[PDB]
Scaffold this motif. Structure first.
Motif, PDB file in Angstrom:
ATOM      1  N   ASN A  40       0.798  -1.213   0.000  1.00 56.89           N
ATOM      2  CA  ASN A  40       0.000   0.000   0.000  1.00 56.89           C
ATOM      3  C   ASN A  40       0.834   1.268   0.000  1.00 56.89           C
ATOM      4  O   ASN A  40       0.424   2.280  -0.561  1.00 56.89           O
ATOM      5  CB  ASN A  40      -0.982  -0.001   1.168  1.00 56.89           C
ATOM      6  CG  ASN A  40      -2.172  -0.906   0.909  1.00 56.89           C
ATOM      7  OD1 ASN A  40      -2.411  -1.316  -0.226  1.00 56.89           O
ATOM      8  ND2 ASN A  40      -2.929  -1.211   1.952  1.00 56.89           N
ATOM      9  N   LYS A  41       2.009   1.217   0.615  1.00 56.13           N
ATOM     10  CA  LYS A  41       2.884   2.377   0.634  1.00 56.13           C
ATOM     11  C   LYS A  41       3.361   2.636  -0.795  1.00 56.13           C
ATOM     12  O   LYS A  41       3.512   3.784  -1.210  1.00 56.13           O
ATOM     13  CB  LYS A  41       4.087   2.125   1.545  1.00 56.13           C
ATOM     14  CG  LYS A  41       3.749   2.079   3.029  1.00 56.13           C
ATOM     15  CD  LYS A  41       5.000   1.834   3.852  1.00 56.13           C
ATOM     16  CE  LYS A  41       4.691   1.798   5.341  1.00 56.13           C
ATOM     17  NZ  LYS A  41       5.904   1.464   6.151  1.00 56.13           N
ATOM     18  N   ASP A  55      -3.284  14.248 -15.527  1.00 58.22           N
ATOM     19  CA  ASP A  55      -4.689  14.385 -15.150  1.00 58.22           C
ATOM     20  C   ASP A  55      -5.381  13.070 -14.817  1.00 58.22           C
ATOM     21  O   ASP A  55      -6.230  13.016 -13.924  1.00 58.22           O
ATOM     22  CB  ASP A  55      -5.466  15.080 -16.272  1.00 58.22           C
ATOM     23  CG  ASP A  55      -4.957  16.484 -16.555  1.00 58.22           C
ATOM     24  OD1 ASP A  55      -4.963  17.312 -15.616  1.00 58.22           O
ATOM     25  OD2 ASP A  55      -4.558  16.757 -17.712  1.00 58.22           O
ATOM     26  N   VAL A  56      -5.036  12.011 -15.539  1.00 61.73           N
ATOM     27  CA  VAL A  56      -5.658  10.723 -15.304  1.00 61.73           C
ATOM     28  C   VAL A  56      -4.758   9.810 -14.490  1.00 61.73           C
ATOM     29  O   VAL A  56      -3.652   9.459 -14.920  1.00 61.73           O
ATOM     30  CB  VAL A  56      -6.022  10.048 -16.635  1.00 61.73           C
ATOM     31  CG1 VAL A  56      -6.794   8.760 -16.377  1.00 61.73           C
ATOM     32  CG2 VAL A  56      -6.850  10.998 -17.468  1.00 61.73           C
ATOM     33  N   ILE A  57      -5.243   9.434 -13.310  1.00 61.47           N
ATOM     34  CA  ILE A  57      -4.496   8.572 -12.412  1.00 61.47           C
ATOM     35  C   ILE A  57      -4.925   7.123 -12.585  1.00 61.47           C
ATOM     36  O   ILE A  57      -6.090   6.776 -12.394  1.00 61.47           O
ATOM     37  CB  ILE A  57      -4.705   8.969 -10.926  1.00 61.47           C
ATOM     38  CG1 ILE A  57      -4.256  10.410 -10.687  1.00 61.47           C
ATOM     39  CG2 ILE A  57      -3.889   8.047 -10.024  1.00 61.47           C
ATOM     40  CD1 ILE A  57      -5.100  11.442 -11.388  1.00 61.47           C
ATOM     41  N   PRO A  58      -3.977   6.253 -12.956  1.00 59.62           N
ATOM     42  CA  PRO A  58      -4.254   4.829 -13.153  1.00 59.62           C
ATOM     43  C   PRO A  58      -4.319   4.069 -11.833  1.00 59.62           C
ATOM     44  O   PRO A  58      -3.702   4.470 -10.851  1.00 59.62           O
ATOM     45  CB  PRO A  58      -3.063   4.352 -13.990  1.00 59.62           C
ATOM     46  CG  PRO A  58      -2.532   5.607 -14.619  1.00 59.62           C
ATOM     47  CD  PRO A  58      -2.664   6.608 -13.519  1.00 59.62           C
ATOM     48  N   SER A  59      -5.069   2.971 -11.822  1.00 57.88           N
ATOM     49  CA  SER A  59      -5.163   2.109 -10.652  1.00 57.88           C
ATOM     50  C   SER A  59      -5.084   0.667 -11.156  1.00 57.88           C
ATOM     51  O   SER A  59      -5.114   0.427 -12.363  1.00 57.88           O
ATOM     52  CB  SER A  59      -6.469   2.343  -9.873  1.00 57.88           C
ATOM     53  OG  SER A  59      -7.623   2.075 -10.648  1.00 57.88           O
ATOM     54  N   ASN A  60      -4.963  -0.280 -10.231  1.00 60.86           N
ATOM     55  CA  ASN A  60      -4.887  -1.696 -10.570  1.00 60.86           C
ATOM     56  C   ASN A  60      -3.578  -1.997 -11.298  1.00 60.86           C
ATOM     57  O   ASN A  60      -3.516  -2.928 -12.095  1.00 60.86           O
ATOM     58  CB  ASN A  60      -6.081  -2.084 -11.456  1.00 60.86           C
ATOM     59  CG  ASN A  60      -6.224  -3.594 -11.635  1.00 60.86           C
ATOM     60  OD1 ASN A  60      -6.396  -4.331 -10.663  1.00 60.86           O
ATOM     61  ND2 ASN A  60      -6.156  -4.055 -12.881  1.00 60.86           N
ATOM     62  N   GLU A  61      -2.538  -1.211 -11.013  1.00 64.22           N
ATOM     63  CA  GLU A  61      -1.232  -1.384 -11.658  1.00 64.22           C
ATOM     64  C   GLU A  61      -0.224  -2.137 -10.796  1.00 64.22           C
ATOM     65  O   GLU A  61       0.757  -2.670 -11.312  1.00 64.22           O
ATOM     66  CB  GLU A  61      -0.608  -0.019 -12.038  1.00 64.22           C
ATOM     67  CG  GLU A  61      -1.311   0.742 -13.155  1.00 64.22           C
ATOM     68  CD  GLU A  61      -0.446   1.851 -13.760  1.00 64.22           C
ATOM     69  OE1 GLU A  61      -0.033   2.771 -13.014  1.00 64.22           O
ATOM     70  OE2 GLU A  61      -0.186   1.801 -14.988  1.00 64.22           O
ATOM     71  N   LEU A  62      -0.458  -2.176  -9.489  1.00 62.40           N
ATOM     72  CA  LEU A  62       0.475  -2.847  -8.590  1.00 62.40           C
ATOM     73  C   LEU A  62       0.219  -4.348  -8.423  1.00 62.40           C
ATOM     74  O   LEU A  62      -0.347  -4.794  -7.420  1.00 62.40           O
ATOM     75  CB  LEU A  62       0.463  -2.163  -7.219  1.00 62.40           C
ATOM     76  CG  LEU A  62       1.794  -2.202  -6.461  1.00 62.40           C
ATOM     77  CD1 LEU A  62       1.651  -1.404  -5.184  1.00 62.40           C
ATOM     78  CD2 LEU A  62       2.203  -3.632  -6.154  1.00 62.40           C
ATOM     79  N   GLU A 132     -11.521  -3.457  -6.321  1.00 63.86           N
ATOM     80  CA  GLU A 132     -10.855  -3.365  -5.032  1.00 63.86           C
ATOM     81  C   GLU A 132      -9.907  -2.175  -5.017  1.00 63.86           C
ATOM     82  O   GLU A 132      -9.980  -1.320  -4.128  1.00 63.86           O
ATOM     83  CB  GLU A 132     -10.050  -4.639  -4.747  1.00 63.86           C
ATOM     84  CG  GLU A 132     -10.866  -5.924  -4.666  1.00 63.86           C
ATOM     85  CD  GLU A 132      -9.988  -7.159  -4.540  1.00 63.86           C
ATOM     86  OE1 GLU A 132     -10.540  -8.274  -4.422  1.00 63.86           O
ATOM     87  OE2 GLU A 132      -8.744  -7.014  -4.559  1.00 63.86           O
ATOM     88  N   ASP A 133      -9.021  -2.118  -6.006  1.00 65.24           N
ATOM     89  CA  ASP A 133      -8.045  -1.042  -6.074  1.00 65.24           C
ATOM     90  C   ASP A 133      -8.721   0.297  -6.292  1.00 65.24           C
ATOM     91  O   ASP A 133      -8.301   1.314  -5.733  1.00 65.24           O
ATOM     92  CB  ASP A 133      -7.030  -1.310  -7.186  1.00 65.24           C
ATOM     93  CG  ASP A 133      -5.669  -0.705  -6.888  1.00 65.24           C
ATOM     94  OD1 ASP A 133      -5.179  -0.895  -5.757  1.00 65.24           O
ATOM     95  OD2 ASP A 133      -5.086  -0.050  -7.779  1.00 65.24           O
ATOM     96  N   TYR A 134      -9.771   0.298  -7.104  1.00 64.54           N
ATOM     97  CA  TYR A 134     -10.500   1.529  -7.372  1.00 64.54           C
ATOM     98  C   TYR A 134     -11.006   2.120  -6.061  1.00 64.54           C
ATOM     99  O   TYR A 134     -10.836   3.313  -5.797  1.00 64.54           O
ATOM    100  CB  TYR A 134     -11.696   1.267  -8.286  1.00 64.54           C
ATOM    101  CG  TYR A 134     -12.556   2.491  -8.491  1.00 64.54           C
ATOM    102  CD1 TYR A 134     -12.115   3.559  -9.276  1.00 64.54           C
ATOM    103  CD2 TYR A 134     -13.791   2.603  -7.860  1.00 64.54           C
ATOM    104  CE1 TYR A 134     -12.893   4.720  -9.427  1.00 64.54           C
ATOM    105  CE2 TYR A 134     -14.573   3.750  -7.995  1.00 64.54           C
ATOM    106  CZ  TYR A 134     -14.120   4.804  -8.776  1.00 64.54           C
ATOM    107  OH  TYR A 134     -14.888   5.943  -8.873  1.00 64.54           O
ATOM    108  N   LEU A 135     -11.629   1.274  -5.247  1.00 61.05           N
ATOM    109  CA  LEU A 135     -12.169   1.708  -3.966  1.00 61.05           C
ATOM    110  C   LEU A 135     -11.081   2.082  -2.962  1.00 61.05           C
ATOM    111  O   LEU A 135     -11.266   3.003  -2.166  1.00 61.05           O
ATOM    112  CB  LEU A 135     -13.091   0.629  -3.380  1.00 61.05           C
ATOM    113  CG  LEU A 135     -14.415   0.415  -4.129  1.00 61.05           C
ATOM    114  CD1 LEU A 135     -15.254  -0.625  -3.397  1.00 61.05           C
ATOM    115  CD2 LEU A 135     -15.178   1.738  -4.241  1.00 61.05           C
ATOM    116  N   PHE A 136      -9.951   1.382  -2.998  1.00 63.11           N
ATOM    117  CA  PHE A 136      -8.861   1.698  -2.078  1.00 63.11           C
ATOM    118  C   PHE A 136      -8.427   3.156  -2.260  1.00 63.11           C
ATOM    119  O   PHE A 136      -8.275   3.887  -1.284  1.00 63.11           O
ATOM    120  CB  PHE A 136      -7.678   0.746  -2.296  1.00 63.11           C
ATOM    121  CG  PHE A 136      -6.425   1.142  -1.542  1.00 63.11           C
ATOM    122  CD1 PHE A 136      -5.454   1.937  -2.148  1.00 63.11           C
ATOM    123  CD2 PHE A 136      -6.240   0.753  -0.220  1.00 63.11           C
ATOM    124  CE1 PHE A 136      -4.319   2.341  -1.444  1.00 63.11           C
ATOM    125  CE2 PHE A 136      -5.105   1.152   0.497  1.00 63.11           C
ATOM    126  CZ  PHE A 136      -4.146   1.949  -0.115  1.00 63.11           C
TER     127      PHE A 136
END
Ligand code: C2F
Ligand code: MRY
Length: 715
Positions: A40-41, A55-62, A132-136
Motif C-alpha cells: 500500500n505504501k 490528469d488521469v491517475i491509473p489504478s490496478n497497476e500494482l 478493489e483497487d479503485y475503492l482503495f
C-alpha cells in the motif's frame, strides 16, 4: 485544455521496496498483513507521482507478480491443479514453484509474463481486483482509472491444450464468455463512480487477419456502454481503419515506436466522433526529447490528449541520484519519473501556461568491406581444417554455459583486494578444469565465475557504454535487471577475457572455448541512442567483439562460443518486418564471428523451436550450433532434418538444466537416437540444454557423468 495520461509507472520503488517485501514474505520474515501494508505504501508512492504530473491517475497497476496472471485470476482462469483459489497462497503457487504457469517474454520486451492456461470455456468473475483497487484509492479520496489487459490481448497471450489461442476460430467461442465477465467488472466500476477505464490491447499491433478485426468489432460493440479508453503500443496498429471504426470514445496510439500510425492518420484521418490520445513520450528509451518538436507532432495529430507511447515500466524509476555517470550523460537522460514530468511540461506548453560522445575514427571505420561479413572459406573447407586441428572423437561432449556459483563465490564477488579476487577466480577456474577432466568432458569451459550477467560483464569493458547505480528495471517476479546505456560510439580499448581464457587453457591439453556474447544481445539488453540506426550500433559492437575473437585466436584458443539469445528475441513483433531486421542481425553476428578458418565458432541459442527462423539461422557463419532438445525428447530436431542441405554440427542438449533431477543415461539415449535418425552421426555433439548457474554442484556432477557415459556407449 490538454488532458494528460500516463501508465506503467514502475511499481518496484526507489529502493526496490517491492523486491524486498516479496522475498521477505516468501522467506516468512514478514506477515501477509505487513506485506499488504508495504504494497500500500508503494501504491501511494505511485499515485503521488501521477497526480503531480498528469490528469488521469491509473489504478490496478500494482500486481504482486504479474498483471497477465492477475487478469487470469479475475476471469477465473485458475488451472485445476491448484485446487480451490485461496488467495496469495494460490497466487504465488501459480507464479512460482513446481506447479507454476509458464513464463515467457511480454511481446518484444525485457518483461516476462505468466502464460494463462485455459482449461474451461466458461469464465466467471472470480475476483474483481479492479474494483478493489479503485475503492482503495477512492477511500483515500483519489479518483482513478483502472488499468486492465483487454479481452483480445488476454486470450492472445494465453494457450489452450499447449497451443496459442491466436486464430479467430480459436478465440470466437471463448470471447463471448470472456467479454461477459469484463462486462460485469465494468458495470461494478461505473456503479461505484468510475469515470474512465484504461484497456490495453497491444496485440492489435501483431500481424492480424481481417478476420481478427471482425471479432474485435463484436467484442467492443458489446462494451460500448462503458467509458473505455483503448491503448495500443510497441508498434503500429495492423488495421488502422478497422481500429478507428471501433465503437470506443477515445483511442490511444503509439506514435514513437513506428511511423506507420502517423502515415495512416495522415492518409485516412481520424473520426471527429472520437478523441485521439497521442503516445508521444517514449517508454522504452531513457533520452530527453526536444519538447518543441513533440508539441508540433501533437498539434499535427490534431489530438487534445497526450501520454507516454508504451508502458513506463521498461525504464528505471528515477535519474535523480545517478551522479557518477560519465560526463555530460545525465543531462541527456530521463527515466520513468522524469518522463512523467516531461508530460507535464508538454501539458503546460500546449495549454499556453508556459555530436555527444562520438568517435569519428571508429564510426567511419565501421562505415567503410563485404569480406568483413564473410569468413575466408566455406564450411566444408573449415570443417576439415578444424577437425584435423582438434582431433575430437565421435559424439564429443561439452557444456555451453556458466557453472554453478557457490555462496563463497557469490560472497567473494561482493566482498577486497583486486589481486585477492583475481587470485580467487583462478583458483576456482583451476578446480573447474580438474573436475571436467575427471568426469571425461571433451571440450571445456572456464566456468565464468567472474561474470554475473552475460551483458553487463562486457558493457563495463566497452567504451561508449555506461552502467548506472540504481537503474533497476523489473524483469519478472522479484528479479530486476540494470540495463547498460549505450550513449556513444562503441569500441573495445583492451582485451576483455584473455586473462581468464588463457589461464584456463594453460591448465589443460584439451580445448577450452572462448565465451562471448553476441552484439545483438548486448544492444537489446541495454538502452541505446536513437540518433543513429540500430544496424550501425550493432555493427560497432560486433566490430568490438571481433577484435576480441582475434586476440583469442592469436593467444591460441581453438574454439570460441558466441551466445546471441537476442537473435530471435529482439525480432519485431510483426513477423512481416522480420526480413529487414534479420538482414542486419545476421550481418551483425557474422561480423563478430568473422574468424579464421581454423577457429571453430559455436553459436548458442536456448530457443524451444527453430521452425520459424531456420532460414535465418542458416545464414549465420558458425561451425556448430547448440540447441535444447531434452524437453521435446529431440523432436526439436525436425526443423533441421527438413532443411534440405543442412550440414553443420549440432550440440544436442540432452538434459533439462531447469530441473534438479539427474537424467538417466537411458533417457538421454532416447534423445540422441531421435536426432540421428536422419542427420549424419558426425554432426552430433552431446551437451546439456543451456546454462548451469541455477543448478547445484551435486546435481551437475552426476548429470555430467551420465552424459559422458552415454557418449561412450554411443561409440
Ligand atoms: C535481460 N534478461 C534476459 C535474460 N535472458 C534472455 N534470454 N533475455 C533477457 O532479456 N537474462 C537476464 C535478464 C532476465 N533474467 C534475470 C534473471 C535473474 C535476475 C536476478 O537474479 N537479478 C538480481 C540481481 C543479480 C545481480 O546482478 O547480482 C535481482 O536483485 O533482481 C535478473 C534478470
Ligand atoms: O507477436 C508477438 C507474440 O509473438 C508474442 O511475443 C506476444 O507476447
Amino acid at each position: 485544455f490538454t488532458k494528460a495520461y500516463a501508465f506503467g509507472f514502475p511499481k518496484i520503488g526507489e529502493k526496490r521496496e517491492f523486491k524486498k517485501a516479496l522475498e521477505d514474505f516468501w522467506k516468512g520474515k514478514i506477515t501477509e498483513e505487513q506485506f499488504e501494508e508495504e504494497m500500500n505504501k508503494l501504491r501511494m508512492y505511485m499515485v503521488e507521482n501521477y497526480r503531480k504530473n498528469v490528469d488521469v491517475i491509473p489504478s490496478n497497476e500494482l500486481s504482486y507478480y504479474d498483471f497477465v496472471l492477475d487478469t487470469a485470476v479475475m476471469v477465473g482462469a485458475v488451472p485445476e491443479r491448484f485446487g480451490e483459489y485461496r488467495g496469495l497462497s494460490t497466487y504465488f503457487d501459480m507464479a512460482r514453484g513446481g506447479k507454476a504457469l509458464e513464463m515467457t517474454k511480454f511481446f518484444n520486451t525485457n518483461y516476462h509474463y505468466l502464460v494463462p492456461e485455459i482449461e474451461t470455456e466458461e469464465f466467471y468473475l472470480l475476483e474483481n481486483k479492479p474494483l478493489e483497487d479503485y475503492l482503495f484509492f477512492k477511500s483515500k479520496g483519489i479518483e482513478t482509472a483502472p488499468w486492465v489487459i483487454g479481452p483480445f490481448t488476454f486470450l492472445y497471450l494465453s494457450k489452450r491444450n499447449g497451443e496459442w489461442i491466436r486464430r479467430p476460430n480459436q478465440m470466437e467461442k471463448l470471447l463471448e464468455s470472456l467479454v461477459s465477465v469484463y462486462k460485469e467488472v465494468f458495470e461494478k466500476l461505473v456503479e461505484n463512480g468510475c469515470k474512465e477505464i484504461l484497456v490495453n490491447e497491444p496485440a492489435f499491433v501483431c500481424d492480424l487477419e481481417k478476420a481478427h478485426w471482425d471479432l474485435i468489432l463484436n467484442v467492443y460493440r458489446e462494451l460500448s456502454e462503458f467509458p473505455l479508453t483503448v491503448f495500443t503500443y510497441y508498434d503500429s496498429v495492423s488495421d488502422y481503419e478497422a481500429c478507428v471504426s471501433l465503437p470506443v470514445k477515445r483511442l490511444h496510439f503509439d506514435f514513437v515506436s513506428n511511423e506507420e500510425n502517423l502515415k495512416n492518420l495522415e492518409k485516412h484521418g481520424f473520426p471527429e466522433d472520437k478523441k485521439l490520445v497521442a503516445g508521444v513520450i517514449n517508454g522504452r528509451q531513457p533520452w530527453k526529447v526536444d519538447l518543441r518538436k513533440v508539441a508540433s507532432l501533437v498539434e499535427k495529430l490534431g489530438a487534445s490528449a497526450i501520454s507516454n507511447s508504451c508502458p513506463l515500466f521498461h525504464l528505471p524509476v528515477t535519474l535523480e541520484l545517478e551522479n557518477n555517470l560519465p560526463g555530460g550523460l545525465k543531462e541527456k537522460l530521463a527515466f520513468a519519473k522524469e518522463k512523467l514530468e516531461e508530460l507535464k511540461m508538454l501539458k503546460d506548453f500546449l495549454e499556453g501556461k508556459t555530436d555527444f560522445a562520438v568517435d569519428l575514427q571508429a564510426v567511419e571505420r565501421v562505415r567503410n568491406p563485404e569480406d568483413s561479413f564473410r569468413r575466408e572459406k566455406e564450411y566444408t573447407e573449415r570443417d576439415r581444417i578444424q577437425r584435423e586441428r582438434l582431433n575430437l572423437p565421435l559424439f564429443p561432449t561439452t557444456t555451453i554455459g556458466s557453472f554453478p556459483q557457490t555462496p563463497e563465490v557469490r560472497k567473494m564477488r561482493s566482498k577486497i583486494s583486486k589481486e585477492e579476487y583475481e587470485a580467487f577466480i583462478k583458483e576456482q577456474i583451476k578446480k573447474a578444469i580438474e573436475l571436467q577432466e575427471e568426469i571425461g568432458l571433451d571440450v571445456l569451459v572456464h566456468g565464468e565465475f567472474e561474470r554475473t550477467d552475460m551483458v553487463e560483464f562486457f558493457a563495463e569493458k566497452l567504451n561508449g557504454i555506461a552502467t548506472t547505480q540504481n537503474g533497476w528495471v523489473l524483469s519478472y517476479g522479484s528479479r530486476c535487471y540494470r540495463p547498460p546505456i549505450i550513449y556513444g560510439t562503441v569500441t573495445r580499448p583492451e582485451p576483455m577475457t584473455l586473462k581468464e581464457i588463457t589461464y584456463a587453457q594453460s591448465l589443460t591439453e584439451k580445448p577450452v572455448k572462448g565465451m562471448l556474447t553476441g552484439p545483438v544481445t548486448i544492444m537489446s539488453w541495454s538502452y541505446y541512442r536513437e540518433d543513429i540506426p540500430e544496424r550501425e550500433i550493432a555493427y560497432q559492437i560486433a566490430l568490438a567483439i571481433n577484435e576480441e575473437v582475434k586476440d583469442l585466436e592469436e593467444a591460441g584458443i581453438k574454439i570460441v562460443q558466441i551466445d546471441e539469445p537476442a537473435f530471435r528475441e529482439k525480432a519485431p513483433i510483426k513477423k512481416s518486418k522480420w526480413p529487414e531486421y534479420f538482414e542486419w542481425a545476421i550481418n551483425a553476428f557474422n561480423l563478430a564471428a568473422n574468424a579464421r578458418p581454423e577457429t571453430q565458432i559455436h553459436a548458442h541459442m536456448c530457443y524451444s523451436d527453430f521452425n520459424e527462423i531456420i532460414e535465418y539461422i542458416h545464414q549465420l557463419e558458425f561451425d556448430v550450433i547448440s540447441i535444447e532438445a531434452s524437453r521435446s525428447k529431440g523432436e526439436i530436431i525436425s526443423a533441421f532434418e527438413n532443411f534440405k542441405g543442412w550440414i553443420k554440427q549440432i550440440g544436442v542438449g540432452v538434459w533439462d538444466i531447469h530441473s534438479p533431477a539427474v537424467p538417466s543415461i537411458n533417457e538421454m539415449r532416447e534423445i540422441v537416437e531421435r536426432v540421428l535418425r536422419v542427420l549424419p552421426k558426425e554432426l552430433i555433439w552431446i551437451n546439456p540444454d543451456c546454462g548451469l548457474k541455477t543448478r547445484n554442484w551435486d546435481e551437475v556432477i552426476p548429470s555430467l557423468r551420465n552424459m559422458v557415459a552415454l557418449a561412450k556407449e554411443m561409440r
